[PDB]
Structure formats: structure tokens, C-alpha cells
Design a protein around this ligand. Structure first.
Ligand SMILES: Cc1cc2nc3c(=O)[nH]c(=O)nc-3n(C[C@H](O)[C@H](O)[C@H](O)COP(=O)(O)OP(=O)(O)OC[C@H]3O[C@@H](n4cnc5c(N)ncnc54)[C@H](O)[C@@H]3O)c2cc1C
Ligand SMILES: Cc1cc2nc3c(=O)[nH]c(=O)nc-3n(C[C@H](O)[C@H](O)[C@H](O)COP(=O)(O)OP(=O)(O)OC[C@H]3O[C@@H](n4cnc5c(N)ncnc54)[C@H](O)[C@@H]3O)c2cc1C
Lengths: 392, 392
């Protein structure tokens, strides 16, 4: 087999990069470890920045989104018996965010690709990357017992945090920045109407809580829990009682509960690797970095990396300007660090940290009061939340 | 599930550690990604140090070895139209090495374990290690769709170069030392009698060649080839002609050729990670380090790591001396660096390096002439080849 751009991983980053490339005439093959079903079983993200919305429209996969996505003009932070709303539309200069599930985005891309006829090998086991610094790198994998080889010009590692790509770069070539938080998020997907028309982030003495949604009849709730918790110890019943305890009385009494469709614990972490490339291999999305879900930036940073790599591969192929690829990491890291800073900030002011002295608790409370009461303060949250501009 | 020591990987390191532990009364569970067959298909090693031979006898798996293993008292280096023999037995003070295939060693251990009834889960997918710095770490994996959890006291990462263990330690906690060589080894297993009763390492202008064996009717040959070669480009016919071209005329004319049972290319590399542990996780064998096969140290260093970890776990469990585990990395690295140095030395004097000036070629030749003609020189090769003493 031979192609122009080999893509490792069929999550949103890979499918999105593959769809854009295909549309521009650049051949690409996607290699996924799992089955289409397993990829589709992941709930994950729900909030999309305008940049991603526009990127999906450019990739030609925005129909269902334009119809089912919910445009949100504000969010709400609850703390100290208060409920403060941030008017995103007004404070950011007209921008908004779109609520549309990652599963849906993934499904839409899978369908578009199926129709296009571009190559996709699911259940590609034992993927190994070779000759990364050569002019002709290649990928080897096993498909039903037989080992195949795939020759290509460039490789895009879109295999997530545990992918083979990042591990295929000499350890001494990368500098890792990581921070692990002492808690996780217990999420619950239910087929019930959301308690609010906008999201509610809540700082509460018992810990953090978040009220989200997927549609007008499908909700997604989370509560901060210790890393020692097991999902089997949390019955639907127990989850509902705890969520209620962490929300304002008026919000709690309007909550329509119900049996969960999904329940899982996601630990929180910040992770950036520098640089994001090695020879003919370029890392994108979770393969290169992780952000706590608090600021809703994961999927959104994957989109900016992908938009960047796509636009650089277009110049290389279409205009013979391959030197531009050297710039991939610099351009991307600028946006990544700012989104990492915001997600870190959000996480620190909304969560309950263990072993926090009196002074720190007061400063945490004051951070909220100040930022949520100052016009200049609200703007810093809004412009970061809607998403900082993509660099050209 | 719950056990005392969870072991990731059923290659020789894992099976050996598991066998010794079981014998001493310490419960252990082995988790292997592949099937017993795939593990058994790997040819690999053929030369064993006395330390490993004694370790197998202690593990109670030495019968077949004592019967089928071939004790070798010397090896031979051919260069510049000369054939110099190193009397290992004499120069090292009585020590020798044993020729017995890794496949055989693996088979013997698999059988011993099967009989013992100790737990072994093959095809354990998605292995993930958790709470490494806690008092109660655990392992999660999938067995036929269902995700199981395994609680344990300690975890021994014996999953080889591409295992999950080394990747589960925070990147910032490890310092990697690596060197990749510009060539690989094309190996060929044949059902023919070996050209010699002892091994012949050959430095030749066309490149390196090695004449080895598995028994009196089974041989294993290798020739150095560029990293750009594909095994499908090397027919048996082509391999035999090239091997012949790289050996002394008298050795070449006594060669019994024949169809290959196996053919594969192994790239060469040196790799050491420091330290070799993190909390309740200890790395052993290829999970922690790689050596070029030139000095025959890979499997042999796995044995010393395992012997060390085993003896430390015995004090921890039997004598309640768990503080001793802190010493694992220090003890092991001392032996590892010396074996890395020897394997590096062997590789540099026997191989053909690209872009070598006149001076370097002459020094390479002089290294051989000196070391192979000096009694003190031969001793340095012999004592290192038979294997340096295990530290207590
Ligand atoms: C609870 C939670 C809430 C979140 N909320 C938001 C939100 O509201 N908005 C937002 O922007 N972000 C959010 N995020 C994050 C977002 O889900 C991820 O950043 C995003 O899925 C990353 O996409 P990816 O394509 O880089 O990687 P992935 O989705 O992880 O996919 C990588 C793909 O590569 C495959 N793969 C792995 N190894 C190999 C291999 N060796 N060979 C081949 N294939 C391989 C994997 O199977 C996988 O299919 C949230 C995350 C979580 C967990
Ligand atoms: C051509 C060649 C010649 C050699 N010659 C010699 C010689 O003469 N003498 C000598 O001492 N050395 C020699 N060596 C080296 C030796 O073969 C290795 O050092 C040895 O096999 C290492 O044993 P191990 O148990 O650490 O790892 P491995 O043999 O690699 O086994 C690791 C096991 O872990 C499993 N695993 C991997 N990932 C996971 C996961 N995520 N979950 C669970 N299981 C997992 C793997 O499937 C594998 O079964 C040679 C090597 C080669 C390649």
C-alpha cells in the first residue's frame, strides 16, 4: 500500500484531518486500532468553539450540526449562594459556543468518509512507524494475521494520549510538562431534559458539579470525586442525591432525574510535549497534549492543530512549499499554552483541593467574586471560553 | 482478582520471575497480551551465561536444559584473513557459556507454570496500571470484552521494549540514554549442522557475519545489513552466497546450506532508562534496557534484574524488610552499564560503519589485533563474555 498522508487513529482529529485532506485532493489512509463501534461508544465532549464549527463546515460535515447543535450565548457559575451568568455573546464581541456531542461529530465524519470512499482500516493491530527522519517513512500493521506495509510521505499521529506515535519519537527529543490533579469527574448521561438552557459550573464545599446537556431531552452531569472512587460504588440514586447537594436549591428542585445511559470516571490532567513533530511525523490532538475538561478545550485544540497541519500540507503539496511544515509546532504551541493556562485557571477556582489552608480558600473565593463582578474580569473568561483566534 | 505480585508480560523475564516467586510461596499473576503460540514463535537468543543457567536450576526448570544445552568453552573472532580463538574457560578462571535457545527456555518455563497451577491470563488486552505511588496499586485489563481489575502489592513490568509499564511512569521521572546503530542483523534459522562446534564472529569488508547454532542439527546465521533492507529481498539463495562471501574460505567450504525455517531483520540499539522503578512498579529486562545482540547480553541482563527483584521481594515478604526494594535500581544499573559498554565495544570493532575515515578503519583493525593478541586483552573479552558476577 502507498499513500500521501498516513493517519494513525480514527477519533475526531484523524477523521477531521482525513476529510479536509481528501476534499483538497490529498490522499490519506486512516489506521484505527478499535472497531467503529468502540470509537462510537465514547461520550466525551459536548462544547464546540466557533473555530471548530467553521472547520466542520469547510470539511462539508455540518448539516446535522447546523440542525441539531444548540448555540449558547452564555454560561453560569454558581458559588457562595450566588449564581453569576457570563454573557459570552456580549463580552466576547459577538462570539458564541455550540453544544453538539463528540459522538455526533464523530458519527457525521465517519459517514462522510464512508461515502467518499477514502481508505480506512479498522482493527489495525501492531501499528509501528519506521524511518521517520528519512524521505520515505512507512507504517507496518497487522490486518487479520498478515503484516502489511504502508508507504507514505508524511505521518499524522492522531492516536490520542496512549497512541504509538508519541512513543515513536526518541525520548531525548521531547520535553514533557505534566500536572496530575488529585481528583476525577464522575459523569452521568441521562435521557432527561437539562435543568437549564445554559451550562452551570458550580463551586460547592462538597466539591465541584457541572450541569450540561446534549439536546433538549438529553443531559450530562458531573461531580468531582477522589481518585480512589470506583464507578460501581456510585448508583444512579447516589449520584442524584450528591448532585442535588452541590447545587443551588432553586436549580436542584427543578431537576428531572432518571436512570443513566452512561457513567464513568475521568481523572484530570494537564500535559504538553514540546515539540510536536519529528521528521515526517506530526502529532495532533490528544497525542500531543491533555487539558482538564473544566475549560472544554480538548477537542477544540485538536481542531486547531488539525486546521494548522491541514493548511501546511496544502502548501507543501499544492504549492511545493514543504519548508513551511517546520513551523507546525511553534504555531500550535502558542495556542495550546494559552488554552492550558485557562483550563488550569478554571480548574483551580472551581474545584475543592485537598489540604487547602484558610488563606487559599479565601483567595479562591475572592478570585470568583472579582472575576465575576468586574467587566474586565468577565471579558477574560468570555474571550477565553469562546476561544482565542486561530493564528494564520 | 487480588494477588501479591502482578506481572506484566509472559516472555522469559516474567515467567522466570513468576516461577521463582511461586516456588518461594509468593503469589503472582502474569498478564500477557499475545497468545502462547505467538510468544513461542520468537527465535531470538541462543547464548546463556552461567548465572542464568544457575537461576533456571534454582527455579527448578533445568532438566531439558542440562540434557540439550551445549556447553561452550571458547568462541572465535575472524578478521583480516585470521581466525583467533578465545579460550573462555581458561581466560575467565573456569567459567563457560551455554547454548540453549530462548524458545526452549520459554517453553520449559511455560510448562512448569502450567503444571504449578499459578495464574496466567493470555490475551489480556488494554492493560493499564493504577495508583503506582499508593499502598494499593491495581491493574485493569480486558478479557473477552469484560474489564477486570487486579489488586496487588507490587507490579513487575516485564513487558519488553514496547510494554505499557515504562510508559506508565511520568516522563519527567525518567532519564533515557539511547543510541541507534545504522544497521540491522539479517538472521536465518536452518535445519542444518552448524559449520563449527563453537561460534564464529566475523569482521569482513562486506560487513559483519556470525555463525551460531541451536543444536547439532540446527544452525542460526546472521549478516549485517542496512536499515533500508526488506527481508523479502533476501532469498535463502542470496543469504547463503553473501554469508559465504564474508567468511574464511576454509569455513565457507565446510558450510552445509539449506532452506530457512525463519528469516527476519533485527535493528540494533542501546537503551538504558534511569531509574528502573516508580513506587510499587519495578521494570525488568527489555522494559528497562536494550543492548545490541553482538555481546549476547539481552536475555542475560533480564535474568540478573529478575534474580535481584526476586531476592528483594523475598526479604520484603519473608522478612518484612520492604525498605530494601529502594535499592533495586542502583544494584541493577551497575551491572547493566558494564554489559552495555561491552556490547557497545563488541559492536564497534566487529561491524562495518558507514562514512568511516582511513584512521578509524585502522584503529578498528588495531583494536582487534591488540585485544586478540594480548593475554590481558583476551581476558577482558572472556570475563565480560562469560558474564560479570551478580552483586549480592
Ligand atoms: C469527560 C470529558 C469531557 C470533555 N469535555 C470536552 C468538551 O466539552 N469540549 C472539548 O473540546 N473537549 C472536551 N473533552 C476532550 C476530548 O474528548 C478529547 O480531547 C478528544 O477526544 C481528542 O480527540 P483525538 O482525536 O485527539 O483523540 P482520541 O479521541 O483519543 O482518539 C484517538 C484514536 O486513536 C486510536 N488509537 C490509539 N492507539 C492507536 C494505535 N496504536 N493504533 C491505531 N489507532 C490507535 C484510538 O483508538 C482512538 O480511536 C472532554 C474529555 C472528557 C474525557
Ligand atoms: C536477534 C537477537 C539475538 C539475540 N541474541 C541474544 C543471545 O544470544 N543471548 C542473550 O542474552 N540475548 C540475546 N538477545 C535478546 C533477548 O531476546 C531479549 O533481551 C529478551 O527476549 C528479553 O526478555 P523480556 O522478557 O524482557 O522481554 P520480551 O521477550 O520482549 O517479552 C515481553 C513480553 O511482554 C508482552 N507484552 C508487551 N506489551 C504488553 C502489554 N501491554 N500487556 C501485556 N503484555 C505485554 C510481550 O508480548 C512479550 O510477550 C537477542 C535478541 C535478538 C532480537
Amino acid at each position: 500500500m502507498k499513500t500521501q498522508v498516513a493517519i494513525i487513529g480514527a477519533g475526531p482529529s484523524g477523521l477531521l484531518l482525513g476529510q479536509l485532506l481528501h476534499k483538497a485532493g490529498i490522499d490519506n489512509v486512516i489506521l484505527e486500532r478499535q472497531t467503529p463501534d468502540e470509537v462510537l461508544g465514547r461520550i466525551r465532549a459536548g462544547v464546540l468553539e466557533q473555530g471548530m464549527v467553521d472547520l466542520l463546515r469547510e470539511a462539508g460535515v455540518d448539516r446535522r450540526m447546523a440542525r441539531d447543535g444548540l448555540v449558547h450565548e452564555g454560561v453560569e457559575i454558581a458559588f457562595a449562594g450566588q449564581r453569576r451568568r457570563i454573557d459570552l455573546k456580549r463580552l466576547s464581541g459577538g462570539k458564541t459556543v455550540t453544544v453538539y456531542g463528540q459522538t455526533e461529530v464523530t458519527r457525521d465524519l465517519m459517514e462522510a468518509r464512508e461515502a467518499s470512499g477514502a481508505t480506512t482500516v479498522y482493527q489495525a493491530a501492531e501499528v509501528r512507524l519506521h524511518d521517520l527522519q528519512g524521505e520515505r517513512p512507512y507504517v507496518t500493521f497487522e490486518r487479520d494475521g498478515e503484516r502489511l506495509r504502508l508507504d507514505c510521505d508524511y505521518i499524522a499521529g492522531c492516536d490520542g494520549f496512549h497512541g504509538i506515535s508519541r512513543q515513536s519519537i526518541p525520548a531525548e527529543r521531547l520535553k514533557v510538562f505534566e500536572r496530575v490533579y488529585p481528583f476525577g469527574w464522575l459523569g452521568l448521561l441521562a435521557d432527561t431534559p437539562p435543568v437549564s438552557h445554559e451550562l452551570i459550573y458550580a463551586n460547592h464545599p462538597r466539591g465541584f458539579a457541572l450541569c450540561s446537556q446534549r439536546s433538549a431531552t438529553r443531559s450530562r452531569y458531573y461531580v468531582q470525586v477522589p481518585l480512589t472512587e470506583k464507578v460501581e460504588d456510585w448508583s444512579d440514586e447516589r449520584f442524584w442525591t450528591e448532585l442535588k447537594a452541590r447545587l443551588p436549591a432553586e436549580v436542584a428542585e427543578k431537576l428531572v432525574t432518571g436512570p443513566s445511559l452512561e457513567k464513568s470516571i475521568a481523572p484530570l490532567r494537564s500535559f504538553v510535549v514540546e515539540p510536536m513533530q519529528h521528521g515526517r511525523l506530526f502529532l495532533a490532538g490528544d497525542a500531543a497534549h491533555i487539558v482538564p475538561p473544566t475549560g472544554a478545550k480538548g477537542l477544540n485544540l485538536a481542531a486547531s492543530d488539525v486546521s494548522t497541519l491541514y493548511r501546511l500540507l496544502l502548501k507543501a503539496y499544492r504549492e511545493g512549499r514543504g519548508e513551511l511544515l517546520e513551523r507546525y509546532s511553534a504555531i500550535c504551541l502558542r495556542r495550546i499554552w494559552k488554552a492550558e493556562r485557562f483550563s488550569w485557571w478554571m480548574t483551580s477556582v472551581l474545584h475543592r483541593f485537598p489540604d487547602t489552608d484558610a488563606f487559599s480558600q479565601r483567595i479562591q473565593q475572592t478570585e470568583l467574586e472579582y472575576y465575576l463582578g468586574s467587566e474586565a474580569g468577565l471579558a477574560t473568561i468570555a474571550e477565553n471560553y469562546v476561544g482565542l483566534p486561530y493564528e494564520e
